[PDB]
Amino acid sequence: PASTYRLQISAEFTLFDAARIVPYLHRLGADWLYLSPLLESEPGSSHGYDVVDHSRVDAARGGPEGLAELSRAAHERGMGVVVDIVPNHVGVATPKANRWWWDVLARGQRSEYADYFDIDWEFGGGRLRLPVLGDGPDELDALRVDGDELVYYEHRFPIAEGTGGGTPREVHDRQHYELMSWRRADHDLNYRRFFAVNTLAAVRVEDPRVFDDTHREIGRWIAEGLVDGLRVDHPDGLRAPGDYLRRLAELAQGRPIWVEKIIEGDERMPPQWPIAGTTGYDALAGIDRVLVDPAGEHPLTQIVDEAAGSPRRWAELVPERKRAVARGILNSEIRRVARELGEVAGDVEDALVEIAAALSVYRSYLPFGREHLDEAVAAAQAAAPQLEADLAAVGAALADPGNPAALRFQQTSGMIMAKGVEDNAFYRYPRLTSLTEVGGDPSLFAIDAAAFHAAQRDRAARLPESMTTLTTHDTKRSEDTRARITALAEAPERWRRFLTEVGGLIGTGDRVLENLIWQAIVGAWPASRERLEAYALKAAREAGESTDWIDGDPAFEERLTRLVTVAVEEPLVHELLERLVDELTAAGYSNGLAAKLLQLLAPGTPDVYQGTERWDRSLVDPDNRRPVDFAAASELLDRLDGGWRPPVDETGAVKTLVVSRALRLRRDRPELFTAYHPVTARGAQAEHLIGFDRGGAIALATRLPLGLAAAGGWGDTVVDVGERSLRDELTGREARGAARVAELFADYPVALLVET
């Protein structure tokens, strides 16, 4: 496809709602609709990742009639449909809604659905441990019997037949499940789950019988022409992801499959995987880093280091926090891998924790990626020479794809990275929070244009059909929030001044977390107190230093709450914040347009998140999933198509112009996109021009806008565009030969030149 447009389908935006805005999306220039999980989820699911019935399209989202209508709307217009599917796990929040889970609770290992899940029965003493009770003592006195069901407040579980009668507790101890305290899920859990989410139980989709049942309706979409490609959720949690994608490719009849897979650096995926590529986060990392002024690296780091009283080094942070979740909320996983290894050596768990800590990829794919495991083991032996013998024997076992533990470890190192680095270490390394993003190396402050172009060339060579992306439903900060934040690398000293001035007014005791919060407030501004308060509490808990998700500090959280309230409502704090936002507003606009244009014409299939044809200043889940005003966007676009040329302003109109013109061009004139050639400028400010030629379409953008303005503008800087004559889709302005960037960017900080 020429592009994918991502839609959050739910009961508030159904498949019928989506089909009604298909014509606006075609107008905007989208090629394929990228929908979220559509199999029946938990009653009230606003994402659909908690599947409870793989046999039908979710009724709340429109059921099969809805899918059929959306597909027909898209296909009658030449458009395509790619659907997010969730192969690894199912929702168990409401058991009475997961017929498979219910039967396993009701009949234990005698359930026909028992080997659909990944259960250590012997660790549980023949029982499935459900971490549903509260931590207070005497919890089970709330256990009531209600017919053929055990009840614990609003939770209901089946009574195995022939086990009724007596105290509610006497019936509970006869059941194939054991209700336990939620805090016991850190260490004593005996079923495989997704991340540290107990309400997401993994299914053994490597079993052909399980694959057939979980993918039958998905297979119907393919067979009957409803769906044109698939996006696989979390393949890294699968036991045999290679085998899965092979089987999915034949289910999808050779149609394009994209995988959500985080890549680290120059790491490569197994080439035999029959996929189009990833959902885009490798591309996000480079687009953002070409807009970071590299000279801010040491100033902005010292702002964090002085606050922490001790250098925050990413090389310590990552191992430390991976170690911590391996020993904490993800310990049931570590302990289970240790049980399957047997008494290989002495301290097997500490050997595992050290290998997962040092592992520099999310997982191996053995025999592929053995290098990564080998280097982890060696690095663990240097960080912990006390276990040199143990690590060697444990690493030796972990290298044999015939050992079930080697395979389970690969299912676990996926989650130690995400929960330790993305959802923790990120929130402790805020020297520039736009670089703490899904798929990025925050240690890598910036990349020069030469490095940017190399990254584009590599994707054209090995991943030409792969997605690129700037916002997803899982990003920590949405694309224009990061665009403004990134300008702080140009003005580190201004930022120090701001933190100081506003921190002499209100604080929490965690000056490191306050750097992160003010960055999000500044980047998202203007934003409601409700949204900023929610973000602040979530960021503070993810960071885990001054409060936590398990055992919070209410006094601290209320200091954080009154920080954001003072930022919105108090006259002097608010003025200081408004003044800094104004100073950055043009820079962030220019950075946001630069990112959007570069991504949409770069090699690959650009993904456009719902509503990001206007400014998206959202924060983390769920702020990046707010309702999207497609009506407003269409009205905006109709003004643009009616010949209005907007200023760079807060309506987003100039972004809608850039997005719509680049999407259409790529969709409707694809003969223009045949190669990739850097376009470099000439003169006093040539460093500020970043761009490339794709064939007959040239993307031209600005980097480091604050320093450009400080230097007096483009001056007499020129771009060589060829002996050819080009025209800018955004303005109609013509350019030939050595064009002055002052003329090219006379109206906007970007231009999209087309051969004539």
The helix or strand, by DSSP H or E, that contains position 682, with its residue range, turns out to be strand 681-682
**Nearest to 30, CA basis, from 605, 507, 548, 733:** 605
CA distance 356 to 362: 9
**447: number of Cβ within 10 Å:** 20
**How does DSSP assign 614-672, residue by residue?**
S-----STTGGG----HHHHHHHHHHHHTT----SSTT-HHHHHHHHHHHHHHHH-GGG
> In angstroms, rounded to a whole number, what is the distance separating the alpha carbons of residues 632 and 642?
15
Longest dimension (CA), the chain: 91
CB 194 within 8 A of CB 221: no
- The partner residues of 720 in beta bridges, in order of sequence, read 738
Q: CB neighbours of 402 closer than 8 A, spacing ≥ 6?
A: none
Residue 39's beta-bridge partner residues? 57
Q: How far is residue 206's CA from residue 222's CA, in Å, rounded to a whole number?
A: 20
Phi–psi pair at 313, nearest 5 degrees? -110, 125
Contact (CB, 8 A) for 416 and 424: no
Residue 280, classed as helix, strand or coil, is coil
CA–CA separation, 42 vs 53, rounded Å? Answer: 9
* Nearest Cα residue to 157 out of 106, 120, 107: 106
What is the spatial distance between Cα 655 and Cα 646, in angstroms, rounded to a whole number? 10
Q: Give CA–CA dist 379/373, Å, rounded.
A: 10
CA distances from 655 to 68, 547, 665 (A): 32, 38, 15
What's the CA gap between 394 and 409, in Å, rounded? 11
Q: Resolution in Å, one decimal, please.
A: 2.8
Answer whether 622's CB lies under 8 Å from 45's CB: no
How far is residue 116's CA from residue 754's CA, in Å, rounded to a whole number?
55
SS3 of residue 419 by DSSP: helix
R_g of the chain computed on alpha carbons: 27
Tell me the one-letter amino acid at 725: S
As a three-state string, the secondary structure of 174-241 is CCCEEEEEHHHHHCCCCECEECCEEEEEEECCCCHHHHHHHCHHHHHHHHCCCCCEEEECCHHHCCCH
Q: How was this structure determined?
A: X-ray
CA distance 157 to 172: 10
Distance CA 50, CA 10 (A): 13
Beta-carbon contacts of 79 under 8 Å, excluding residues fewer than 6 positions away, are: 22, 25, 26, 30, 31, 32, 33
Whole-number Å distance between alpha carbons of 202 and 217: 19
Residue matched to tokens 């690493």: 395
Residue 507 carries which DSSP code? -
Cα 208 to Cα 598: distance, rounded to the nearest angstrom: 43
Instruction: Name the DSSP letter for residue 368.
Output: B
Residue 241: CB atoms within 10 A of its CB come to 27
CA quadruple 451, 376, 233, 542: dihedral, nearest 10: -90
The CATH superfamily of 479-583 is Maltooligosyl trehalose synthase; domain 4 (1.10.10.470)
Nearest to 90 by CA among 189, 266, 280, 234: 234
Distance from C-alpha of 347 to C-alpha of 632, rounded to nearest angstrom: 61
Print the SS3 string covering 24-53. HHHHHCCCEEEECCCEEECCCCCCCCCEEE
Is domain 95-202 in CATH 3.40.50.920, yes or no?
Answer: no
Contact 598, 459 (CB under 8 A): no
